[PDB]
Design a protein around this nucleic acid. Sequence first.
RNA 1: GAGUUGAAAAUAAGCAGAGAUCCGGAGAUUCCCGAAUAGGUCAACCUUUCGAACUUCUGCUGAAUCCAUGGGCAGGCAAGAGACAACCUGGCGAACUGAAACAUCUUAGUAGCCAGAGGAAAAGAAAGCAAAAGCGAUUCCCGUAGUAGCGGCGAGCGAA
RNA 2: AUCCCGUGUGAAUCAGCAAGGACCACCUUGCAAGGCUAAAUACUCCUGGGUGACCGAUAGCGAAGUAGUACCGUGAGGGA
RNA 3: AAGCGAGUCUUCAUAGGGCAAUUGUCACUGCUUAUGGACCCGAACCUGGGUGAUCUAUCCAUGACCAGGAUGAAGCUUGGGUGAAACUAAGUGGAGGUCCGAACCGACUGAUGUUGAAGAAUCAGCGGAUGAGUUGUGGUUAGGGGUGAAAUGCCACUCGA
RNA 4: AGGGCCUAAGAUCAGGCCGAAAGGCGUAGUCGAUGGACAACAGGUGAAUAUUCCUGUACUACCCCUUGUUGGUCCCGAGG
RNA 5: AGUGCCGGAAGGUCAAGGAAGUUGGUGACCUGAUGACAGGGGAGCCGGCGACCGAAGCCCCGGUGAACGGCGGCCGUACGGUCCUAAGGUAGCGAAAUUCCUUGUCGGGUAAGUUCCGACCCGCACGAAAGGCGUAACGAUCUGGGCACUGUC
RNA 6: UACUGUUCCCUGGGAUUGGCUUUGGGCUUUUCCUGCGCAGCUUAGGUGGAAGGCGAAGAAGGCCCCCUUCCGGGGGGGCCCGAGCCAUCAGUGAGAUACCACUCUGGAAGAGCUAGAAUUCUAACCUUGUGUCAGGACCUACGGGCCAAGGGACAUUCUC
Lengths: 75, 45
Amino acid sequence: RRICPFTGKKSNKANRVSHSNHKTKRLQFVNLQYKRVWWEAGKRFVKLRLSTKALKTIEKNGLDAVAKKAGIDLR
Amino acid sequence: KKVKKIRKIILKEDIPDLGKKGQLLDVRAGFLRNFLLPLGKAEVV
RNA sequence: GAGUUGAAAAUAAGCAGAGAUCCGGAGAUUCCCGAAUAGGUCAACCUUUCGAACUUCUGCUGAAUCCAUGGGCAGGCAAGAGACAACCUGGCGAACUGAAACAUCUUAGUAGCCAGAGGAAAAGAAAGCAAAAGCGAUUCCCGUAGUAGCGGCGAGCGAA
RNA sequence: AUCCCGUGUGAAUCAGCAAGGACCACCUUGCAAGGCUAAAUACUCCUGGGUGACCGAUAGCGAAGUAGUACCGUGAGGGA
RNA sequence: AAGCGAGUCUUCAUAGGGCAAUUGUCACUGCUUAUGGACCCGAACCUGGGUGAUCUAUCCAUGACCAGGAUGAAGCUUGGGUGAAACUAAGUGGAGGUCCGAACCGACUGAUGUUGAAGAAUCAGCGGAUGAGUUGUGGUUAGGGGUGAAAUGCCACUCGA
RNA sequence: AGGGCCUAAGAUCAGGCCGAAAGGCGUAGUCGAUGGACAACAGGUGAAUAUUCCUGUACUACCCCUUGUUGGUCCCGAGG
RNA sequence: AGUGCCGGAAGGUCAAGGAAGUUGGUGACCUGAUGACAGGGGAGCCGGCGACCGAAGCCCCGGUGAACGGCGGCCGUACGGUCCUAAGGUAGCGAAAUUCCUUGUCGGGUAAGUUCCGACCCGCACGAAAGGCGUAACGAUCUGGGCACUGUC
RNA sequence: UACUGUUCCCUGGGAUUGGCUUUGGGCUUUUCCUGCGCAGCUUAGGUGGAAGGCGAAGAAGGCCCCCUUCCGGGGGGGCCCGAGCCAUCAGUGAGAUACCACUCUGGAAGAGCUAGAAUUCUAACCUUGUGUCAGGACCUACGGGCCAAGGGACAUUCUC
């Protein structure tokens, strides 16, 4: 599923247009990733699927601050 | 366009090259996130 | 309050003024299949150890690592599940057609599928309108008006 | 312009911020990035009560008879 | 257009010229016009969502089947013949997308049939018939698809969708 | 003969991965005979059943009792 | 040569994206003549225009034909002259499942043969892996001739 | 080899995305040189504050090496020497880097500013294990944890 569990971001609809306006539909996906994060208390790896902006939010406000807004934790 | 990442790294371990166990020098977030703060060798201001 | 034991209506035996048959409100029962749920299955059956399966509730436990998580055993009336004409909210989303052809455009965010819930639903209490004059959350009808507009400035679309 | 979104950037805090159909100045209006909320409004598988310049068995529901039956189709489905 | 107004626009800015200097409205009924299927019946199609591999195309798993009769390969043995091989006569042997031919599977020719006995048959003959063979059961593949020893053939008397 | 045993093709699939929804992949298992594993024959009878009822003679699986051994049972490592 | 494919310097062409600079809007604040607005215009905030850097691709350069494909005219006496082209068909076969003209002509087969067999070559318009030419076997294959056989006649 | 698009694929900018190190890019300041058609003591680009700088803040000439070199003759490290050298003057379209103001050409040391590199590193990221680790029991059954091995900020993935 193309959903970041933290930001709640989805893919977006887009009628991506030619020079002549002969449209289609396609999805502008989210810039997700499988990546390890570093928990403060535990001090372990956490193998998660996040957005790029999720990283920015985690580096802003420490994991547990962010992770309360998506109920599930302790893997 | 591009933007350089500048973080406010305080140290803990001696560090092979640049450290003091008390520097206030700045680096990219790739040092803190991937190398140091996993190992517990530094902290953010 | 007088005759009844469903429909077609025949028999046989009963129950009825100490009050039936009936009518209403509230309860009890409800084989098997079906969300199906002890396990299996070719729906209405077969096997059992006779069991609400599965999940969040709640009691203990104790993995790979301390804590923890997975997991196992318990108690549980035990909340959930499925169904439902239209209306409605959200997701995906056509083409024929019209443009006397056709690709922008139109058909239309319509039909369809998918998910969700109520008696309505959604909206909704100004980071709003409006003009130097004022109004005070939404929603629905009349109206402004087929006006201001947008538009291969074509077909058409069309506000406040 | 206003409203919402993928990508990347990335503010300020009422000496503030946003809107007033690019945009700047001055006025005026409001306070975004947390929530909840009856009514008037939409509809008919359906119940009760009423009405009809509605139908009367080739009509009216497909269906006035034990009809979605008989029958057809592998099946979805069609259908007296 | 600002604006002006019985006038106004046109322009050094006149003269000239254009357009003005006025007049009901609400119903009912008809006739036409417009929008909706729009006088009625009638396409081939397009798109969406479902249902089909009991027919047939390929494959898979498991079983089953192929009367009877022919031919005589490689090898092997024993002689003949070599320094030994080579080569050659007889035996043995039972190969083969081998032969002839029932069941089985097909479909070349004709005749018959043509409101048929049958929505592809009957009859007389035909090819393969131990293999790239036939076939029962239970499965797999799905329509912008599948499958195809390839004809656009087959995918439930439907197939250029 | 099937089921109460076993598995193949195939199916469904806990946890797990992936996907607007519907769902897709996939292990542990669980189903799934067309295969493996398993114990009965003759004669007799009768409107309609017979390896099923009758008569004779059989066989498989359990509960008695005589001897016993101290553990069994499942998982499990092999033969087959 | 063309196209395809493969490989290859420098040069040209070259997007998004940056980027030194130009030019406009707005405006505190100074200023200007009778006509009712006009000159500038600091900071900030807005918008445009962009010297330079910027890949692949393409042009450009080489190689490749069991890669797509293509394999000539005109004039004179086997032999020469001359033009065009990337190059002008080699072996083989040839009137053919290719041949129009056409029942080509010649020979064989028959009393007589627009079909058949062999040869010629004027190959309209065969040709070497869309293979060329041969070939024992095999064919419910096409196409000629004979024997036997008969109501096919 | 019709028009317009869509996909597969390739290529760059940006995110994921880190680190040192040397070599020779562009631009910005300090300071220093440099720059011989012809007049000819002048390897002088245009122009200018306008006539004493400088010297004993250890000098003319020279020893030998260094920078530049269109090989005409500039510029300069230290010192034997020892405190002089010299500006208009005559040749020129111009006057003397005697002091010094401002800049074109082309270059030498430092400082900043970024960018282009190649390599390696490893900690992101990718990939391997009949390597090990266990619930009541298995994983030579998918996967999970742990050490590890190989790649390596490329690659993959998102956007433009």
